[PDB]
Amino acid sequence: HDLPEGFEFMEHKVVNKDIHAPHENLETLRLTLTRQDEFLLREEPVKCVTVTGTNGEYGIYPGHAYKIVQLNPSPLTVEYTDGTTKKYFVSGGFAHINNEGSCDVNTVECTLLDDLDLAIAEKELAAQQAALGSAKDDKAKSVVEIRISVIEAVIAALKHH
Amino acid sequence: EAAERNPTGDNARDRLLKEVLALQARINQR
Amino acid sequence: SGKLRLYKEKLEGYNRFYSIVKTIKMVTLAKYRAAQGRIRTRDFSLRYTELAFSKPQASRDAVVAAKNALVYIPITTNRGSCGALNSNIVRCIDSVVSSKMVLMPVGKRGIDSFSKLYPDEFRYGIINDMKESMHFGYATFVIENAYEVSKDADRYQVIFNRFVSAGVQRNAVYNIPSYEKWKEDLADAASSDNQKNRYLFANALQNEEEQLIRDFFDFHAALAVLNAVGENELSEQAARLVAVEGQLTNISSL
Amino acid sequence: SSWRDHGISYLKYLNVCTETLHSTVKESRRAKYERWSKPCYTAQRPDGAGGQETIDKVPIHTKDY
Amino acid sequence: ADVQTIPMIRGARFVALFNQKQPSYFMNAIVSLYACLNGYLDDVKVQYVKFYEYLLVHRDLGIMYGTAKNKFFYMYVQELNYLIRFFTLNSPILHGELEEMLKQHTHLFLQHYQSKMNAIKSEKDVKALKNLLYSCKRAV
Amino acid sequence: VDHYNVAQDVVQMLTKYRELQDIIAVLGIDELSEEDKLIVDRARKLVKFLSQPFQVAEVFTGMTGHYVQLDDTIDSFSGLLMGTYDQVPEMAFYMVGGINSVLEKAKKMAEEAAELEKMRRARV
Amino acid sequence: VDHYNVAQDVVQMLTKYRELQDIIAVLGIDELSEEDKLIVDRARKLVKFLSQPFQVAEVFTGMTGHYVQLDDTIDSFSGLLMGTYDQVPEMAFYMVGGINSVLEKAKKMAEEAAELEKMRRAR
Ligand SMILES: O=c1ccn([C@@H]2O[C@H](COP(=O)(O)OP(=O)(O)OP(=O)(O)O)[C@@H](O)[C@H]2O)c(=O)[nH]1
């Protein structure tokens, strides 16, 4: 009695390029932006994608080398070959960049920057700041500071444009 | 230990039961 | 006459058993069509999760050498009337029983069924109220409890139901090896020609720092759990609609 | 940053961030996203005497992390 | 029809006691019902109630183990039926010795019998116990 | 005594199964207590086991008849109640004589199942 | 008018409770709405509150009978319908007389429950 593995029912596998192979000139990056097991974008050709990982900002274009990036709460930019821009905001996750010309950005939450409200973002920071002053212990203060970092990133993200 | 010093029809049913259980287990394996 | 009215009363109850069941069919045909959105938006989140964990290994060598605990996390529905999903899962679990088996089932029916049947292997279960959408936090709660149940665990295995179509609900298994065994295999896939498809992926992880790898391991493990519960819910609603048809026909024959 | 030193895991870090991000969303759109960050899970073992005992090994609410 | 409450614990044992094959002497029946009523059988498993009753009626554990300090109230004194039928079992003349008789019987029964019964795993022993309990149904 | 005790236990099992059968037909077999599923499985095996191929009906049955000695009737049923034969398939008890015939039929069914499994596996 | 209105409300509630019983039987008590369960909880109290020990059935029941005045019955049921006694335990309405006897029985039920809790606490 052998059971199927849950990945057998998934028909869109990841294609890796053999290292001993000729290079190709690619003008499109196939992006897959995903939230909580839901793709907002699927193998969607985009000219470029800008992502904020722990070390800093990465601008991924077609042909980018194989890399894994641990994202931080921050904006994410997706620019199509039309030159049109779509800006999301992510709270965390990972970005897998493949040398074959694909980028699978899996996030816990990915919301268009339009949906976020700056007025709500500002008042929320003030509330958490008061708690951080009265936060009982070190652990509570650390959690509160996590919220503030995300809020300030959101506030700064919206003030940018 | 001191017990050691001084001191078939049902077997057929047990034998058959063991064989059937073995076959039912073998089919599971492969 | 009382005897004649005895049948009439009996049929009176049957005639309304149908109405209550018919309303239930309507209730469960709203939630099936509400959760049909996943059908469109699935099959793309778990792409590099395959590389992380997809290993078509034998079913004997992976359980015969159970040096440490094996933590099974079957997915079961809170409410009955689903069908044969829970029964099959129990059969799938009964077929793996071991000395080193620990159970952390999900759902009230899973807890009740696995508490009675295997009483020295069950530890405790997780229950979620089907009020909100199956989210990442619930998956993180499953994993954290699983680790605390047995941190020194050879593997954590999730046994759930995959909704192939409206009438097809198979059983699927996500097997997550613990950090030590995963990083060892990840080290072999990088250096050796064996596991070619994972060569580039493994070397791209070994280049980064360890904490990132540990976060990567936990993150993808959560996604696998999230997919299983999400699928198990969709299979549940689809199965209930079918079962709540069988009851209608049985109540029509009577 | 400083949460790692206190034993907080990465998964709990993400849950806090997601809740905060959902907090900033407009009130009109908050309903959709907030259904994805509302704890509704618990851990229970059937007691000996036909009862249910909750297990406090993992926190459920971001406040108690 | 609709959580181990005293009503539900004692009711199941009452039903188990109600099974009979031959008419029971009044003294034996009333004293068994009394015991099950006052919770003396709460620690006794439902399957073993008849065996408990058989020992109470046709045996005397206190005398067997030399712990009987009663003066007159013993189950082998069949003449006590009419005294019970006159004064009631909740009367000062009879209440104290009855409680002590059932209190010693419960303690001795649980210690020396139920412990061994719950420790039986051998097929031969299991089958032997099954015959015993069924016989106890048709005896008391 | 053994004959009497076995007979009463069988009757009690069948009595309970009848009552559970009312629930089974309306809702379904999977809406029952796990304890009552074991009783159902044992009861179904008893019902199948009670059947017997008669030597006078070799035409209508198509099978050789059986004569079951009372001492094998008691032993076979007593063992079945204990649950030592839970692994045996339900259909193995259908249209057979004593317990030995049940085991032989189970062996043949297992061999056929193994052959089918081998054929399916070889198809890979 | 109060007597007529109270009686009609009782009858309607009992009728509705019987219909809800089918749903409790099929779906279960959990699936009933907030309003429905309040009808269920109130109606069950009405069913048990209609019972009464008679002065001639003391041997059958083993308890003294009660003679409930007409006004007491109307007031007691009127308060029950509008939820004045929603917090009273259900069994306090079983085999009693007027509302006063209900409160006394509830008090007795509370006392014995406290004693049982104390016995459990010592254990
Ligand atoms: O002392 C060290 C050395 C290296 N590293 C980490 O090892 C990894 C080596 O990363 P790489 O060598 O593969 O690339 P990189 O320098 O371009 O990396 P980025 O800044 O673009 O992400 C990077 O993620 C770096 O932060 C440390 O964290 N600490």
Written as one letter, the residue type at C49 is T
The 8-class DSSP code of residue G55 comes to T
Q: Which domain holds residue C112?
A: 31-240
What's the CA gap between D42 and D56, in Å, rounded? 9
Residue F27, phi-psi category: left (phi > 0), alpha (psi -120 to 50), beta (remainder): alpha
Q: Is C57 near ligand 1, meaning CB less than 6 Å away?
A: no
C7 located within any domain: no
Asked if D18 and A92 touch (Cβ cutoff 8 Å), the reply is yes
Question: Please, which residues bridge with residue C71 across strands?
Answer: C102, C156
Q: With CB atoms and an 8 Å threshold, state whether C44 touches A42.
A: yes
**Cα–ligand 1 centroid distance for A56 (angstroms):** 11
- With residue C110 as reference, give the H or E element that holds it: helix C108-117
- Count the domains in chain C: 1
CATH of the domain at C136: 3.40.1380.10
Q: How far is CA C107 from the centre of its chain?
A: 10
CA distances from A54 to A73, A94, A95, E136, F95 (A): 9, 10, 12, 78, 73
**Cα–ligand 1 centroid distance for C140 (angstroms):** 28
Work out the widest C-alpha separation in chain B, in whole angstroms: 48
The 8-class DSSP code of residue F54 comes to -
Q: Which domain holds residue D21?
A: 1-65
Residues in chain A with CB shorter than 8 Å from the CB of C159 are 3
Do A and F make contact via 3 or more CB pairs under 8 A? The reply is: no
| Phi, then psi, of G25 in degrees rounded to 5 | -75, -40
CA distances from E136 to D4, E19, E132 (A): 68, 10, 6
Instruction: Count CB neighbours of E104 within 10 A.
Output: 19
What's the CA gap between A7 and C47, in Å, rounded? 9
* Chain F, nearest residue to C254 by Cα: F26
Q: Residue A25 is encoded by which pair of tokens? A: 């000139």
| Phi, then psi, of F63 in degrees rounded to 5 | -130, 155
| Phi, then psi, of A17 in degrees rounded to 5 | -90, 125
What's the CA gap between C133 and C139, in Å, rounded? 12
Q: Residue E63 is encoded by which pair of tokens? A: 């005398």
The side-by-side arrangement of strands in the sheet containing A110-112 is A57-60, A48-52, A74-79, A85-90, A110-112
- Count the domains in chain D: 1
C3 located within any domain: no
D30 in reach of chain C (CB within 8 A): no
Q: Is C209 near ligand 1, meaning CB less than 6 Å away?
A: yes
Per DSSP bridges, beta strands A29-35 and A102-107 are: parallel
Asked if A114 and A152 touch (Cβ cutoff 8 Å), the reply is no
* Ligand 1 atom 25, closest CA: C208
C251 located within any domain: no
How many Cα atoms are found within 13 Å in the side-chain-facing hemisphere of E77? Answer: 12
C4 located within any domain: no
